[PDB]
Amino acid sequence: MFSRIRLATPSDVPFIHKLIHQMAVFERLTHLFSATESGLASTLFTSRPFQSFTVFLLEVSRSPFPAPSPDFTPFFKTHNLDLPIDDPESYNFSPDMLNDVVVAGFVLFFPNYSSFLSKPGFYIEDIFVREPYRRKGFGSMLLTAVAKQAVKMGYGRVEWVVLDWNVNAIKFYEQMGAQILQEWRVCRLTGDALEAFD
Amino acid sequence: GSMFSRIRLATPSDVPFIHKLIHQMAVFERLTHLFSATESGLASTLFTSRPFQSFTVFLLEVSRSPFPATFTPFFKTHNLDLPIDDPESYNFSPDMLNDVVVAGFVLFFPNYSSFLSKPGFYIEDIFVREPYRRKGFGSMLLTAVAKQAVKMGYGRVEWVVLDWNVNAIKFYEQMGAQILQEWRVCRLTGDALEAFDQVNI
Secondary structure (H helix, E strand, O other), X not given: OEEEEEEOOHHHHHHHHHHHHXXXXXXXXXXXXXXXXXXXXXXXXXXXXXXXXXXXXXXXXXXXXXXXXXXXXXXEEEOOOOOOOOOOOHHHHOOEXXXXXXXEEEEEEEEEXXXXXXXEEEEEEEEEEOHHHOOOOHHHHHHHHHHXXXXXXXXXXXXXXXXXXXXXXXXXXXXXXXXXXXXXXXXXXXXXXXHOOX | OOOEEEEEEOOHHHHHHHHHHHHHHHHHOOOHHHOOOOHHHHHHHHOOOOOOOOOEEEEEEEEOOOOOOOOOOOOOOOOOOOOOOXXXXXXXXXXXXXXXXXXXXXXXXXXXXXXXXXXXXXXXXXXXXXXXXXXXXXXXXXXXHHHHHHHHOOOEEEEEEEOOOHHHHHHHHHOOOEEEOOEEEEEEEHHHHHHHHHOOO
């Protein structure tokens, strides 16, 4: 199985929306899933890669790949597996049924900033791999792509959050040399509280 | 004789003042050993997008004379009559023709949820120089970001707080912020980040 990581464009909006759908189902967040295709598409038309909302898509194919910003070329990795992958929804994630290319995952990230370094960084909002393609290295590949891109661009940090009880995730992040800056707490002003500011 | 104040967008000419403000913040926080910010770094990173599309700075400025109309909220400041002891005012004056002094800043940028239709803002820093504190300026800076979010149809404003800073937590709760207690910040930096460049993808 061949794999490639590439920047999403507006034509990828349906796949990204379906990936977020699956993610919301898995994470039990469907009640707050209000993002729309047209909202996503607007953002993808509006956003300069790496300077705003950015998506990398992971695609897989049984045949090799051909090989949207000055600062990027696609990442690649071949795999091996004569295990059948049962993916009956593959058609819903395929930009090309002639060549059997299937979207298997994504990462959504955007720039943050270290005032102390005067350097941008990246914050990873989400990494999602569809269930049939898990435990094959793809999620790690998506994280790697963001890290590599940061280094390429001279960015200072890559950050994200973890659930304080998710010991498996914590250990994984620590193993790759991430630090858990465990005293900070996220604060959020939304809804009527936010609207009160006028 | 009241002090007048305004909040305005930083432009490239403000780079020296932003540098000095971050430096003072590092001094106040006793983290000067971690400060390696440069003017050229600020200049080349802060102004690559239009305001509000990426990194955005609002500056707080004060004057003993009024500001002509050209992001200052509803002007709810106090202690404006008090003498200012500001020996560094010369270092924070954008124009020696006038008596305008830069007194603080907020640095923020868009964030995004996968699930929710609207973007938000994340606030990286709010700092008011010591001589100008307890006049409402810091609250005004936070207010300016919140009102900008409402104006642009953004759904949330976020930041972090230290878990032991009960006074700050109570202040945020008083304005209706929630503390999302389950999350921990993870950070890949330095050699651990650089190590990823060796991965052949």
